[PDB]
């Protein structure tokens with residue numbers, strides 16, 4: 001599994 | 014290094030066209046498997062709320078066609094979220110983007126194998142955001158997916174969401190409703 005929470009997805013944007 | 018996603022996802026777009034067949038309006042926009050490529054797509058494509066009536070976006074696992082007939086969806090169903098016509102300017106894009114992040118970021122725990130993809134239908138009578146799963150009889154798994162969806166999108170109890178088989182004599186009741 002590879003899991004990204006919303007906070008992380010954001011900082012990539 | 015781009016951050017790899019657990020799997021490949023394809024974005025599809027359907028433009029409403031009363032001229033041609035449904036299946037011919039469906040175009041695969043791109044396939045991606047990193048967070049960075051997801052954003053490059055999302056940042057440059059039109060907001061859901063901006064679409065013309067009858068248009069849809071689909072985000073499905075690569076190799077799953079976003080149709081009822083596909084072997085991955087044939088025995089499946091969807092959690093359906095109706096977006097009030099009046100509240101769509103504040104909820105439509107938020108709901109859609111939160112659902113995309115929840116799916117690509119694998120936020121559905123040990124149930125991620127059951128998720129096929131997400132759909133937004135932009136309509137005059139009211140928009141719909143849906144999450145498609147592969148097995149309509151897996152009640153425990155489906156309920157759980159729904160609880161997480163509700164949470165991610167912050168859908169209040171005043172606005173039930175329902176899980177139904179993909180649509181003879183009788184109107185089919187939903188299998189699950191939250192709040193029940």
Ligand SMILES: CN(C)c1nc(=O)c2c([nH]1)N([C@@H]1O[C@H](COP(=O)(O)OP(=O)(O)O)[C@@H](O)[C@H]1O)CN2C
Nearest residue numbers: 035036067069079080081082083134135136138141
């Ligand atoms: C294989 N095949 C033809 C076929 N296979 C399909 O998989 C498929 C269709 N046709 N779809 C067409 O769009 C209408 C649903 O729109 P909607 O869900 O936006 O709901 P409304 O337009 O709001 O009533 C359906 O009535 C159907 O005409 C949709 N769809 C998924």
